[PDB]
């Protein structure tokens, strides 16, 4: 093309403003660009990945640099529980003198406090001085440059990888599993043993003395001799003060279980052992596929041979090998799905099994991290289903996958969708019904008539791991259980202490109130899934539009006929599911925050009793904890929470603005724009200036996207302010 | 002194840079190669 969308003649030859809008949003769909060959596609994608990696490293470099140049890491290291971590400095020419003072509280210059947890992580991993952080930043800047060079290099004529190289699954998997994940873990345990653990005990091991400071007194003698037990002897005493030698030990690899008494975090020795074990597992697993050395498995054969003899699963997995290798969308979907689960797990396990020192005592940071990863997880999950649908519309070959496990899924689509619908209905009616019952009776002044179910099943699981409050004498909660006898001399001692300590988030106590919220979360997952799954299955066709596959993943509609076909494309399913995703994640995050807020405040009872009905959430959570935020700036002054206050209102604006695009549709606006064109052409003086791109209204799908973005941005921003200002304003 | 950098770079990054970038994009999208 000769216009902006060089990759699309259709858009390029467009006489309106759409040319600009669409060109920007269709830029990264390399597969649909004019004149795209598969080889070029892969090559360009590979190079683009190098660029993304570089951006990630530049981002990390910046954090280190700004903390080192404008932060208080060293002071924090000295007094971790009495210093507020600094992120970066503030230079806003719009600030008033008062603001300069407010944001400069506790320091000598205006500054922003970090709620990212970097200080704790770096403290745990070994960083003790600002100069060290600087070196890291410089190194990452260099690595970023190297990655950029690689992107250019592999796009050059003699270094462009072949399409075959891009499809050698065995070699990549072997290498990625054994080297990227396995050896990297081994390297990490090396760092922990050589640098981190020594630092925790007061010894400095850096690039200056690492080659002459043995990690363990015995040496590598025990390792090669086979007497590995030596490395687990003399674990740090329970009276050990972190970052000092008082009460220190010599152990480097142990399975103590539990948390360091003073830092209330997992033992470093245990983490080292953890990564060492994981390393061996992955390195071994990376020797499973054939890679030009004779031995190994061929993935195609494995998939083809797996067909249940009964015939209940049809022809089995035959045909899937080719489908996956020849479809980038399916690959992306599988990846996003797994990463989404991982992100949720990080959030869930990181607040219970605190990994970093003094992180549990920083309430605001702990709250931010959870909400951060949970939201990212939602986006990652939705994307997986989205690309799954794109696959069906674009890359699915009905003939190749004949009676395959995948095809049969599309044969009982109605069954799946219908049953998922029933589940959603059941959960919805009863969950809401029970909440309303509890609200009404309480309102009428009769709280004794509430329907409160104890979460017995969950309580049982907690007891099974050792919790004793519930009084369920089972498994690890039983002294006579075979399980207790097994680990009583291994890891249970430490675990049974933490699990039965009320001041830890390991298996928090649950009650009737938790039962209901969990069932609400269930509703969210099921309903969000219904929308996404339906979109995927009904993406290649439906009774209303039996030829949907010929129109694509995203199209405005199919006309006002046959009853009306608005929002009938698969893209619209993503659009609709996004709202539900936000709602469910919101419920999850609200639950975590309120529960923890009450615990931190010392009144766990408030949640226990007020969480049973809806008014409680509104009055004892949203209304009560909004007081610090809404008073960031008042008719009498301002404080450091002013920025957070302003953002809260800003979020509401964006959210509501989104509604305009969602409820108002194109026809109205197009007609109005026409009148404006008339005016400009008929008004003297302004007539001198004219447009080169005809002014037109936004398209149907465009408006949907714009609206969803406005809704989403406002949603996240408003909650971000609340979770931070409320927690910090009250407990910090 | 490095301390003066915040007051010398921020004006440029938030005002001069964005302007020139937007101008270039306009010239790029309004041109008919």
């Amino acid at each position: 093309a000769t216009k902006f969308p060089k990759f699309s003649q259709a858009l390029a030859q467009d006489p309106a403003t759409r040319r600009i809008w669409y060109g920007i949003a269709t830029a990264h769909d390399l597969e649909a660009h004019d004149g795209m060959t598969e080889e070029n596609l892969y090559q360009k994608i590979f190079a683009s990945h190098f660029g993304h990696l570089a951006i990630i490293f530049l981002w990390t470099s910046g954090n280190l640099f700004h903390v080192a140049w404008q932060g208080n890491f060293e002071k924090w290291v000295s007094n971790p529980l009495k210093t507020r971590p600094i992120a970066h400095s503030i230079w806003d020419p719009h600030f008033g003198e008062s603001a300069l003072k407010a944001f400069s509280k506790g320091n000598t210059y205006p500054v922003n406090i970090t709620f990212s947890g970097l200080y704790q992580w770096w403290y745990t991993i070994g960083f003790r001085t600002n100069q060290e952080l600087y070196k890291g930043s410089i190194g990452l800047l260099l690595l970023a440059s190297v990655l950029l060079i690689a992107g250019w290099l592999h796009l050059q004529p003699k270094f462009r990888p072949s399409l075959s190289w891009f499809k050698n699954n065995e070699s990549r998997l072997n290498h990625h599993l054994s080297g990227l994940l396995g050896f990297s873990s081994l390297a990490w345990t090396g760092h922990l043993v050589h640098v981190a653990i020594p630092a925790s005990r007061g010894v400095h091991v850096g690039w200056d003395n690492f080659l002459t400071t043995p990690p363990h007194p015995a040496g590598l003698t025990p390792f090669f001799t086979g007497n590995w037990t030596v490395y687990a002897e003399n674990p740090d005493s329970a009276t050990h003060v972190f970052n000092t030698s008082e009460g220190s030990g010599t152990a480097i690899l142990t399975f103590l279980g539990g948390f360091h008494p003073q830092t209330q975090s997992l033992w470093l020795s245990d983490m080292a052992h953890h990564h060492l074990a994981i390393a061996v597992v992955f390195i071994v697993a990376g020797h499973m596929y054939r890679t030009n050395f004779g031995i190994g498995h061929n993935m195609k054969e494995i998939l083809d041979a797996h067909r249940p003899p009964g015939g209940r699963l049809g022809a089995g997995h035959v045909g899937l090998f080719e489908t996956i290798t020849n479809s980038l969308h399916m690959q992306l979907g599988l990846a996003l799905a797994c990463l989404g689960v991982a992100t949720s797990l990080t959030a869930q396990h990181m607040y219970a099994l605190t990994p970093y020192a003094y992180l549990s005592k920083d309430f605001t940071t702990e709250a931010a991290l959870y909400t951060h990863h949970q939201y990212i997880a939602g986006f990652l999950m939705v994307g997986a289903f989205a690309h799954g649908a794109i696959f069906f519309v674009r890359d699915y070959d009905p003939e190749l996958n004949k009676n395959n496990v995948l095809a049969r899924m599309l044969e009982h689509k109605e069954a799946i969708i219908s049953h998922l619908s029933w589940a959603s209905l059941f959960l919805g009616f009863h969950t809401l019904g029970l909440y309303i019952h509890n609200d009404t009776v309480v309102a009428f002044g009769q709280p004794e008539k509430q329907i409160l179910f104890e979460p017995l099943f969950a309580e049982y699981i907690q007891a099974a791991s050792g919790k004793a409050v519930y009084q369920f004498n089972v498994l690890l909660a039983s002294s006579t259980s075979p399980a207790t006898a097994a680990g009583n001399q291994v890891w249970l001692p430490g675990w049974l202490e933490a699990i039965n300590n009320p001041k830890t988030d390991l298996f928090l106590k649950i009650g009737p109130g938790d039962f209901l919220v969990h069932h609400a979360i269930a509703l969210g997952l099921h309903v969000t899934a219904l929308i996404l799954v339906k979109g995927a299955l009904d993406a290649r066709g439906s009774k209303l539009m039996p030829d949907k596959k010929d129109f694509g993943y995203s199209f405005p509609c199919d006309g006002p006929g046959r009853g009306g076909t608005c929002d009938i494309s698969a893209w619209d399913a993503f659009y609709l599911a996004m709202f539900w995703m936000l709602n469910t994640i919101g419920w999850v995050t609200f639950y975590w925050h309120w529960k923890h807020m009450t615990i931190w405040g010392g009144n766990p009872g408030q949640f226990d009793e007020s969480s049973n009905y809806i008014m409680g959430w509104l009055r004892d959570y949203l209304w009560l904890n909004s007081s610090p935020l809404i008073n960031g700036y008042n008719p009498f002054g301002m404080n450091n929470l002013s920025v957070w206050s302003w953002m809260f209102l800003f979020g509401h604006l964006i959210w509501a603005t989104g509604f305009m695009f969602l409820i108002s549709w194109r026809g109205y606006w197009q007609e109005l724009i026409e009148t404006l064109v008339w005016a400009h052409e008929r008004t003297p003086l302004a007539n001198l200036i004219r447009w080169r791109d005809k002014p037109v209204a936004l398209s149907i799908v465009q408006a949907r996207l714009v609206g969803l973005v406005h809704f989403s941005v406002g949603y996240i921003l408003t909650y971000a302010a609340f979770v931070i200002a409320s927690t910090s304003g009250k407990f910090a | 002194a490095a301390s003066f950098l915040p007051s010398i770079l921020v004006p440029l990054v938030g005002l001069i840079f964005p302007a020139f970038s937007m101008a270039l994009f306009f010239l790029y999208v309004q041109t008919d190669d």
């Binding site: 640099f65 410089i138 800047l141 950029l148 | -």
Partner: peptide, 29 residues
């Protein structure tokens, strides 16, 4: 304390990244 020289060195490194970034972008174009 990060010295001025250290800060200036960092800035020089960043510049290299920038010039190498423009090229990658223009090569992908």
């Amino acid at each position: 304390m990060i010295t001025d020289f250290q800060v200036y060195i960092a800035l020089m490194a960043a510049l290299l990244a920038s010039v190498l970034a423009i090229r990658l972008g223009a090569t992908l174009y």
